[PDB]
Structures are given as C-alpha cells and as structure tokens.
UniProtKB/Swiss-Prot annotation, chains A, B:
Keywords: Cytokine, Disulfide bond, Glycoprotein, Secreted, Signal. The keyword Transcription does not apply. GO terms for cellular component: extracellular region; extracellular space. Glycans are attached at N111. This is Interleukin-10. It is found in: Secreted. Belongs to the IL-10 family. Disulfide bonds join C7-C103, C57-C109. Produced by a variety of cell lines, including T-cells, macrophages, mast cells and other cell types.
C-alpha cells in the first residue's frame, strides 16, 4: 500500500536478521556439500546483476518462491535429522521476506494497491450493477492508463 | 528481461493506440450508460494517485487483469449485439498491455528475469542433483539477497 511501514528497530536490525539466516544454513551446510558431487556453479553471476537492476525486487521475489516451493520441500525429506533444520531455514527466509515487504517499501513488487482493493470491494457489493458501472466508467479507466503513460513519455 | 525492447514506431505510436482504444469503447458507451442507473463514482481518484506513485505499474497491471477477467466476461454476455464490440475492446486493451510490456521497460512489473529462467532451466536438467546443488549454494543465495538489501540501506 502507500508503503512506509512503521516498524521498530528498522532498518537497524537487518544485518542481525541475515546473521540469523546464515546461522540457520550453517546447521545444514555439511550434509548438502557432501551430497553435491559436482564442481559446476548453478547460481550464476547474471542472477546478481539482475538483483541489482530495475527487475531486482522481481528476481529476488521469484528466487525466494523458487527455494520455498521447488527446493526446500524435497530437501527436507532427504534425511529425518535434517528436516527440522531445513524447515527452520525456510522460516528465517519467510521472516526476512515479511520484514522487507512490510517496512518502508523494501520489497515493493510484493505490495498491493490499497486503492485497487477498495474499488474491488465496492464493485463486489454492487453485484450486477457493478458490471454496468465498471463499463460505463471505462473512459475514466483509459484516462488513468494515459496518465501512467504520459508520466513516462513526458519530461 | 534486461528490458529495452527493440520496437519500431515507439514510443511515437502510443497516442495512436489510446485513440484506437477510446474509439473501441465508444462503440459500447451508450449501452452501458443506459444500463447503469446510479450516480456514484466507482473508479475513485485514489486509484489515479496509486497509478502515479511507486506501485503504479502494479496497480495498472492489476486493474487490466480485473477488467479482462472479472468485468468483460459478463459484460460481453449482456446482449448478442454488444458481444463482438466488448471482445474487440478487450483485444485493444491486451494489444496495449503487450506493447508496454515488450518495449523499453514501460510495464516492468510484468517482465521476468532472464537470469532466473536460466538457473531454473539448468536446475531442472540436473534433476535430483539439482536439489543438492541448490542447497549447497544457499550461502551464495544469502550473498545475493544481502547485495539487494545493501543497495537500499547504503548511500
């Protein structure tokens, strides 16, 4: 929403959170280095370049979702004694994700427009009448799209 | 991806596209103003303010999806003679959406990281071995997340 959070100890506790995250991976680092028997690199440096440019929020968001949904669910089931530690590592990753999304627009690609939620709330209460009113104001929707476009093509 | 499109007649044809879009709504404007029997405003000005700030790409993207998925499918079925015109209006809206997404980062919230697609491609070909390699390089993933964070908290 119109961002800027209201979070205490922020952004001062960010380094502390990354240390908690590195300490949780340390509890599973040996198991996984021994299972991995290849010397090639997967997380290439082009990934770092994308994190630092204009699509960085989106590339980081997609990589957090990739690890929580396509990597962590199978790793956790690799041995009964690494399961609690792999789910704790996932929780520190989700706790970090939540702090950047909630506080002062640090993961803006994941925030949602409060004005859109309100229009959708009002539309749903008008029921059938919402369809006719959204269509009758379509020209106001074109005026809003043009304002977004002019803002980029104008000086 | 690393954006900047390569589109001819751009951005010079943008005003022409919005005129084509206003001409298509004009073919259905009377039907919908007569069905709508209310005088209140649905598309409030707070929506315009969100289109112009930091969440503007996301608010515009969510409103295009709202109209194509929750408004247009029922409006099109309101009368047999307005169906072709409501689906044409939808097509001009999708044609516009595609031009801003493809050309020079005009709808960046909808572009995808090419480096993420490549890592996901390589991970899938390693199969079981991909799980172990993604977990062994988890510390490199923390280094990339820290680079995104430092870039905002550092001067």
């Amino acid at each position: 929403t119109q961002s800027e959070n209201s979070c205490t100890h922020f952004p001062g506790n960010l380094p502390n959170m990354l240390r908690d995250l590195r300490d949780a991976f340390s509890r599973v680092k040996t198991f996984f280095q021994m299972k991995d028997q290849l010397d090639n690199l997967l997380l290439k440096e082009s990934l770092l370049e994308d994190f630092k440019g204009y699509l960085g929020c989106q590339a980081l968001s997609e990589m957090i979702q990739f690890y929580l949904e396509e990597v962590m669910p199978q790793a956790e089931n690799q041995d009964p004694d690494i399961k609690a530690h792999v789910n704790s590592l996932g929780e520190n990753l989700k706790t970090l994700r939540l702090r950047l999304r909630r506080c002062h627009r640090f993961l803006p690609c994941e925030n949602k427009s409060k004005a859109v939620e309100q229009v959708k709330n009002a539309f749903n209460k008008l029921q059938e009448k919402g369809i006719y009113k959204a269509m009758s104001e379509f020209d106001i929707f074109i005026n809003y799209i043009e304002a977004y476009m002019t803002m980029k093509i104008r000086n």
